[PDB]
Structure 1
């Protein structure tokens, strides 16, 4: 991979070849990206799995959740064409993107009463049925996650453009807990170490010891980061990684930060999160052993909409850990209000 790359911070120019770790985590939602193989395979898979108690599908990536909104009419139409009483009802998504328990599985011998080419058009809509299949949505009460499908898709055919970007997906032959490794990134060049995917930009730097510096999340999946794409993954303690393993945190020493512990109960219920190390405007933090223990993260503004003046931390390290999102500014799990109870 040859080319030339300019340096913004160093005010220099470089040229050469090798491995390029790329953007498209920020500045837009490019890489739309997902589209399956011949949908007859998926239709046969879902109609086969419906008989053993598969009641829903929980998305593993919000891009693939957006994918499902483009085949549900086609899937309903082909399901009706095969004289099986089953309808699919999709829905929206809000974090945290939960994790299912069961998964799709071949049966690679599909329903041979379907078409073969991609030229079928002039499709007609369907109606409601007594037996309905739900898709990722706010219906956690009717059917639990224990009876839904999760992580049953994988990229094949090298999955790229032209034109915008195009992965052609095949359903996973085996159950798995890790994320999809055919689109992942991890690199380090003498000052920074980034971990990248569709929605994660965990990046660390070195001032005096290697530690996390900033991260950005456009989604919060529940698939474990595979250990084959994590730098410096030895002797790592689960009680010190900033981003928990359950929320796709890389099991690495670059996830550490001195004076901090695991952020299990942070403001993860948001959909978009910025991980900087500053103060929220109008607020200050002071180190004090008299401050209370670490509890769930609290917004810097009350429900009525009033700011908080002072803050205290037990054994944190300046600058503090704060969050960002649509609703405003949050703080770390180890920081409590100075005197407010």
Structure 2
């Protein structure tokens, strides 16, 4: 990586060569774009899946849904000019990028993404069947060429991932993940910006300090592409398995949501699904408590409000008439 960067304290310009790990979620200008391989190959793969009995596909990344939406008309043209009665419908991403149990091999209605339905579940939908072939060119926005995978795997594509550590600051980056960490008497996670919630597994070749990791202590659960590292850990908290993951984009941070107070009281209820501060009628709950936390509290900053972690419980409301996370069990 030829080039160099200035420090965060104004002017400490170190210049040389090495490996650069750069934030991608917090950008105004798009920096990466997905490009398919050929309209002819994708149409043949879709027809082969239709013969096999595949209803549709489930996008793995929010940058892949755009790529699938951008070629729907061309796929429809190719399918129509073949004597085949088939229609490809491009949906939109809403909630968790759920995983299917099917894949697409290299060469009615075919529904792509879309809201979860019962006519054809994710049981027979194709998921995680693209691999990065190489990187293209472009002054500011570089494009990425995709290819069909050889087989099937639950591990995310490792050609789009990063991980770095320097002095007392680590990071586990991705195209839609940015998980930070720091050291203050302990190595623990401090913030995590997510523009999506995927499901494939984080590979262990791109993780820092991935030994002795206990699966029940990972703040971002392994089922939601959380790194299998000890930097993915916060003291006093366990895995947030029933958090507000249905929101889609999240902003994990440590602090207090505006207008509320959290106190450590042993006379508190056990862990349960994450609750929103504002009631469904707009009323705010301003008194919360938790058993054995570590201040400051853990909050998720979604689009519809500020949530709390799985261990913090209210003291003002009965929790019967409060909106909770939609993650089932």
- TM bin, normalised by shorter chain, reads over 0.9
Match of 2:315 in 1: 338
How far 1:32 moved relative to its partner?
A: 4.9
- Alignment of 1:22 with 2:17, yes or no, is no
1:105-161 alpha-carbon deviations (Å, 9 max, x no partner): 13x4xxxxxxxxxxxxxxxxxxxxxx1111100142111101100001111123453
Match of 1:144 in 2: 121
Match of 1:75 in 2: 75
Query: How far apart, in 2, do the equivalents of 1:38 and 1:162 lie?
Result: 24
How far 1:163 moved relative to its partner?
A: 5.6
Query: How far apart, in 2, do the equivalents of 1:26 and 1:210 lie?
Result: 24
Are the structure 2 counterparts of residues 205 and 163 from structure 1 closer, same or farther at C-alpha, using a change threshold of 3 Å?
closer
1:134 aligned to 105, 111, 118, which one? Answer: 111
How far 1:24 moved relative to its partner?
A: 2.2
How far 1:91 moved relative to its partner?
A: 1.1
How far 1:4 moved relative to its partner?
A: 2.8
- Alignment of 1:222 with 2:199, yes or no, is yes
1:29-75 alpha-carbon deviations (Å, 9 max, x no partner): 61351110112111111101111110110100111011111111100
Query: How far apart, in 2, do the equivalents of 1:161 and 1:144 lie?
Result: 39
Q: How does 1:194-213 map to 2 (within 5 A)?
A: 194-213=171-190
Are the structure 2 counterparts of residues 154 and 232 from structure 1 closer, same or farther at C-alpha, using a change threshold of 3 Å?
same
Query: How far apart, in 2, do the equivalents of 1:139 and 1:277 lie?
Result: 32
Match of 1:94 in 2: 94
Give ranges in structure 2 of 5+ residues lacking alignment. Answer: 319-329
2:289 aligned to 306, 309, 312, which one? Answer: 312
Query: How far apart, in 2, do the equivalents of 1:275 and 1:11 lie?
Result: 30
- Alignment of 1:181 with 2:153, yes or no, is no
Query: How far apart, in 2, do the equivalents of 1:32 and 1:12 lie?
Result: 29
Match of 1:236 in 2: 213
How far 1:3 moved relative to its partner?
A: 2.6
Are the structure 2 counterparts of residues 32 and 4 from structure 1 closer, same or farther at C-alpha, using a change threshold of 3 Å?
closer
Match of 2:7 in 1: 7
Deviates more, 1:11-20 or 1:311-320: 11-20
Match of 2:275 in 1: 298
Specify the structure having the higher radius of gyration (Cα). Answer: 1
CA contact (8 A) 2:190 2:253 kept: yes
The normalised TM-score by structure 1 is 0.90
Question: When the two structures are aligned, how many residues end up with a matched partner?
Answer: 318
